[PDB]
Amino acid sequence: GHKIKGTVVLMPKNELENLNAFLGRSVSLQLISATKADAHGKGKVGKDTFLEGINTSLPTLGAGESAFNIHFEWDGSMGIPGAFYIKNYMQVEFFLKSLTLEAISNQGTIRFVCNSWVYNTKLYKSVRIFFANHTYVPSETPAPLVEYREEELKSLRGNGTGERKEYDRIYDYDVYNDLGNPDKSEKLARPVLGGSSTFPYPRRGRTGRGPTVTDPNTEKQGEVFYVPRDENLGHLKSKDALEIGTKSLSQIVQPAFESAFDLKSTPIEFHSFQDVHDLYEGGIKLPRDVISTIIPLPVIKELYRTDGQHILKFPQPHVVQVSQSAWMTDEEFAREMIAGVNPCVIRGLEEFPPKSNLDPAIYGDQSSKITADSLDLDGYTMDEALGSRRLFMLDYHDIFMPYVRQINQLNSAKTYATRTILFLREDGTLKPVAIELSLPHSAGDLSAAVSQVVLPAKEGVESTIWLLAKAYVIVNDSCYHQLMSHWLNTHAAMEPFVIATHRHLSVLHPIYKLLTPHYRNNMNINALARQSLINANGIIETTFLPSKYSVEMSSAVYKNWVFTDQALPADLIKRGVAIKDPSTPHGVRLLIEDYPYAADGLEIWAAIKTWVQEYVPLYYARDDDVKNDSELQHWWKEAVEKGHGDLKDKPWWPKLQTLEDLVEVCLIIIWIASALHAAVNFGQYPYGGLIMNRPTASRRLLPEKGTPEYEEMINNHEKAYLRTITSKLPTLISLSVIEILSTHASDEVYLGQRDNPHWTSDSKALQAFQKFGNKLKEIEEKLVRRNNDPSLQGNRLGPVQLPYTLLYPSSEEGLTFRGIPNSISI
Ligand SMILES: [Mn+2]
């Protein structure tokens, strides 16, 4: 009789860290009709059908994959299959890749893209269901699939209670109340971030471990921070499981390094710049037991060259691959504000002196002490520089001032709230022309140290003071980069959208299909970060200036986060680095014409925009179709009201009642997840792998004349600098982490790629996606030409001779300084 021939592709667990065992009655599939229903309107369900044998005749599966034959009975009463149930009767879970129902014609083949772990059947409340690869808005769902579609969303939402288990697939929200460890020590207590006006914050994925005993508002510790199962990516190669390196670094490598310092087996401090360069030349010699602890660990072992006995050697950072000293030029200091690790904070300055919005009743007179007449603007007057839009600034004054007092009370942290003035030279490069180093002076609670202005100098002790002023600025910048440009604006801001998408858009939904590639690995890296990166006494607190105030500073900045200002053109306009100009291809004119991040970013932005504008009309012809999609409406309402709920009343949220709003929302989400993250992430070790170039912390203020510290500035400027910036032990730990986080796994999926070519059956969507990938390849060719253009050398390469490749769409594996993943995946 008639049978439907199927092929099941799966991966046994050991591949992602005997095939005959899958045969017999080990694995049952049941087809589900999309066209014929039972008396309650639900698609008819076929009989249990088991895997029949191993298929070895297929044209090479992917690594670790095995294919199995199956044949389903399916008479005329059953209609057309559109879904299936699967039950795993084996003890061990397996990774289900796909089901394919073969047909006479390729046209008739029915494909199911699953990519999901299937645990033993007794671990599931309801049987796992998978849908064919057709795409439907809710009003197009075949009637026999409507209830299944909704019941699956209900299953994914859960009920807001219970500890989440490894095999759960439940997506929900919670506040950042899991970072402190008060049951261990009150030193480890941290404010809850989110759920208040004092500390507003994006929500994260609910884990449900339950309260601590000492603080009912803080979540107890656990060995594993849950994510919904299919968010926890398995990898064929352990070296690609980069996210696990943070936990090893904090829990194993960091105590190993600490022991070498405690035992005085290695100098406690760097004593010259050459001691730092040594780290990637001959390496660092450490006790054998420290080497033996570190080098066998997955992911960690890839970070260092070693002899297995005595030496760890870091890779040579890109920033020093051509010149060891160019980082210390004023040219490079300014260039990195437009082409460095954090190229998105500089602003136009349209008046002089710069102003503060902070209350002098709190901090003392907040007037800027920089005088226009003190600046060398290459012969320009201040009025000319302002009128010609040549003045810019890197302004950390108002951001840092409210935290300076409490940071400076910590042992071995001292900072200023800095402001750097930049001039756009006639040659198109930026020139730093003044640094203001500000301290609060509450009249009644100051200390004795004063604010001051430092001007450029090339000789004498004043040149060292200027070099130190640059370090204070870059400590501010490094903190803002890692906590705000990077952690807050990418990792943290995106996770609410991931959760809302799974809770409210079916796998069938076109906008689920559009957005979910841009979420790959994001909940997973974030959960591992809550455990080991941003936790109390974790990697960032123990290596960056603000210590226990680090994450809360990001919540203070989130007060000002605006979703629609994350769009690249809006960001550039808001920061005064571009103006609206409809006579240009991108609709904005850059005020720094050779601004590599912005100029390349606008190309990528435009390509994403075209893709979203082509894809949306395939599913929504009119504004009313957007209004009428109940999944989409619930999705966006929840993303805002719950996911970003502390900002839910802000007037700038798109209402999502039009095609233009749907395009804008999707475009911004994709931009944040792909290009924005890439631009702020993949330069971490390339630029920051030399601690002097990107200091993470400062430990003392400027010395006063007539002290031994001032005499050291005169006699040993390198030691003065090294004593001011991050100490050697936290340097080793922070270099290690940024090396991990700058690495592309070999199984990454980049912008213009998907994890399966059959993600939809809709040929128009597949065609539009192909055009997007082709456009990205054309853009890459254009960006290569920019880097090869000698006219652009000053900003695109600088004296470090490092071509700006962070917005090249494609990359090979490794620490490449290029390539745009689809998602926030590391
Ligand atoms: Mn990242």
2 is catalytic: no
What spacing in Å lies between the alpha carbon of 690 and ligand 1's midpoint?
A: 19
**Chain-centre distance for alpha carbon 159:** 29
In CATH terms, the fold of domain 344-477 is Nuclear Transport Factor 2; Chain: A, (3.10.450)
Q: 522: how many CB neighbours lie within 10 A of its CB?
A: 24
462 — phi, psi (to 5°)?
-60, -30
35 — phi, psi (to 5°)?
-125, -15
Q: Which two tokens stand for residue 304?
A: 């260092």
Look at residues 614, 613, 654 and name the one whose alpha carbon lies nearest to residue 635: 654
**Chain-centre distance for alpha carbon 543:** 19
Rg (CA), the chain: 28
Look at residues 86, 592, 97 and name the one whose alpha carbon lies nearest to residue 348: 592
- The domain over range 155-254 is classified in CATH as 4.10.375.10: yes
- Taking each helix axis from N to C end, the angle separating 728-741 and 254-262, rounded to the nearest 10 degrees, works out to 160
What spacing in Å lies between the alpha carbon of 445 and ligand 1's midpoint?
A: 39
Buried b (16+ CB within 10 A) or exposed e, 776-802: beebbeebeebbeeeebbbbbbbbbeb
Indicate the CATH number for domain 255-343.
4.10.372.10
277 marked as binding residue: no
**Chain-centre distance for alpha carbon 271:** 35
What spacing in Å lies between the alpha carbon of 693 and ligand 1's midpoint?
A: 20
Helix (H) or strand (E) holding 3: strand 3-12
Look at residues 614, 601, 607 and name the one whose alpha carbon lies nearest to residue 752: 607
Among the listed residues 441, 491, 509, 586, the single catalytic one is 491
What spacing in Å lies between the alpha carbon of 344 and ligand 1's midpoint?
A: 16
CA distances from 266 to 68, 261, 272, 543 (A): 57, 6, 15, 19
Mind spelling out the 3-state secondary structure of 428-473?
CCEEEEEEEEECCCCCCCCCCCCCEEECCCCCHHHHHHHHHHHHHH
- The CA distance from 436 to 525, in Å, is 37
Residues whose CB is less than 8 angstroms from the CB of residue 680 and which lie 6 or more positions away in sequence, other chains included: 341, 342, 343, 344, 481, 485, 486, 489, 490
771 — phi, psi (to 5°)?
-60, -40
Q: Are 43 and 84 in contact (CB under 8 A)?
A: no
**Chain-centre distance for alpha carbon 643:** 17
Q: Which two tokens stand for residue 60?
A: 């090479």
What spacing in Å lies between the alpha carbon of 490 and ligand 1's midpoint?
A: 7
Identify the residue whose tokens are 């559009």: 514
Q: Which two tokens stand for residue 381?
A: 């007057």
Residue type, position 149, single letter: R
Residues whose CB is less than 8 angstroms from the CB of residue 6 and which lie 6 or more positions away in sequence, other chains included: 29, 69, 70, 71, 72, 99, 100, 101, 102
Residues whose CB is less than 8 angstroms from the CB of residue 586 and which lie 6 or more positions away in sequence, other chains included: 569, 602, 605, 606
Q: Are 554 and 403 in contact (CB under 8 A)?
A: no
Among the listed residues 397, 486, 518, 644, the single catalytic one is 486
- The CA distance from 404 to 413, in Å, is 10
Identify the residue whose tokens are 């070895």: 56
What spacing in Å lies between the alpha carbon of 681 and ligand 1's midpoint?
A: 5
Q: Which two tokens stand for residue 490?
A: 């990418």
What spacing in Å lies between the alpha carbon of 682 and ligand 1's midpoint?
A: 8
**Chain-centre distance for alpha carbon 758:** 27
Nearest-10 Cα torsion for 626, 632, 638, 641: -10
Q: Are 171 and 205 in contact (CB under 8 A)?
A: yes
Q: Which two tokens stand for residue 147?
A: 């209830």
826 marked as binding residue: yes
Look at residues 276, 314, 277 and name the one whose alpha carbon lies nearest to residue 294: 314
- The CA distance from 391 to 349, in Å, is 5
Burial group, residue 621, by CB count within 10 angstroms (0-12, 13-18, 19+)? exposed
Query: Phi-psi category of 576—alpha, beta or left, where left has phi over 0 and alpha has psi -120 to 50?
Result: left
Look at residues 101, 98, 90 and name the one whose alpha carbon lies nearest to residue 2: 101
Query: Phi-psi category of 161—alpha, beta or left, where left has phi over 0 and alpha has psi -120 to 50?
Result: beta
Burial group, residue 393, by CB count within 10 angstroms (0-12, 13-18, 19+)? buried
The H-assigned helical ranges of 575-700 are 596-615, 623-627, 630-638, 659-671, 677-681, 684-688
- The CA distance from 259 to 282, in Å, is 21
Helix (H) or strand (E) holding 99: strand 94-101
Q: Are 663 and 612 in contact (CB under 8 A)?
A: yes
Among the listed residues 681, 693, 795, 822, the single catalytic one is 681
758 marked as binding residue: no
Resolution in A: 1.1
Q: 42: how many CB neighbours lie within 10 A of its CB?
A: 17
Q: Are 771 and 607 in contact (CB under 8 A)?
A: no
244 is catalytic: no
What method did the depositors use to determine the structure? X-ray
Residue type, position 79, single letter: G
394 — phi, psi (to 5°)?
-110, 100
HSE-CB for 139 with a 13 A CA cutoff:
10
Tally: H helices and E strands in the chain: 26, 22
Look at residues 430, 403, 429 and name the one whose alpha carbon lies nearest to residue 417: 403
- The CA distance from 263 to 260, in Å, is 5
Residue type, position 443, single letter: A
What spacing in Å lies between the alpha carbon of 515 and ligand 1's midpoint?
A: 18
In CATH terms, the fold of domain 478-824 is Lipoxygenase-1; domain 5 (1.20.245)
Report CA torsion sign: 242, 246, 249, 251. Answer: negative
What spacing in Å lies between the alpha carbon of 220 and ligand 1's midpoint?
A: 26
What spacing in Å lies between the alpha carbon of 22 and ligand 1's midpoint?
A: 39
Q: Which two tokens stand for residue 587?
A: 């609709």
486 marked as binding residue: yes
- The CA distance from 402 to 405, in Å, is 7
Q: Are 757 and 770 in contact (CB under 8 A)?
A: no
Q: Are 398 and 436 in contact (CB under 8 A)?
A: no
What spacing in Å lies between the alpha carbon of 638 and ligand 1's midpoint?
A: 25
In the chain the first and final C-alpha atoms are separated, in Å, by 52
**Residues lining ligand 1 (ion), CB within 5 A?**
681
644 is catalytic: no
Q: Are 382 and 372 in contact (CB under 8 A)?
A: yes
What spacing in Å lies between the alpha carbon of 815 and ligand 1's midpoint?
A: 13
139 — phi, psi (to 5°)?
-75, -5
235 is catalytic: no
Pairing verdict, β 110-118 and 578-580: unpaired
**Chain-centre distance for alpha carbon 796:** 24
What spacing in Å lies between the alpha carbon of 680 and ligand 1's midpoint?
A: 8
Look at residues 697, 738, 216 and name the one whose alpha carbon lies nearest to residue 472: 697
Angle at 107 between CA 101 and CA 108, to 5 degrees: 35
Nearest-10 Cα torsion for 697, 699, 702, 707: -160
Q: Which two tokens stand for residue 427?
A: 């040659």
311 is catalytic: no
Identify the residue whose tokens are 């930026």: 430
Identify the residue whose tokens are 């007449």: 373
CA distances from 436 to 200, 323, 331, 408, 432 (A): 30, 29, 18, 17, 12
* 92 DSSP assignment: S
Q: Domain 5-154, what architecture?
A: Sandwich (2.60)
CA distances from 85 to 1, 102, 150, 402 (A): 23, 18, 16, 57
Residue type, position 663, single letter: V
Q: Structural domain boundaries of the chain?
A: 5-154, 155-254, 255-343, 344-477, 478-824
Beta strands in 146-215 (DSSP E): 173-174, 204-205
Among the listed residues 504, 518, 644, 677, the single catalytic one is 677
Q: Is the backbone peptide bond immediately before 799 cis, with ω within 30 degrees of 0?
A: no
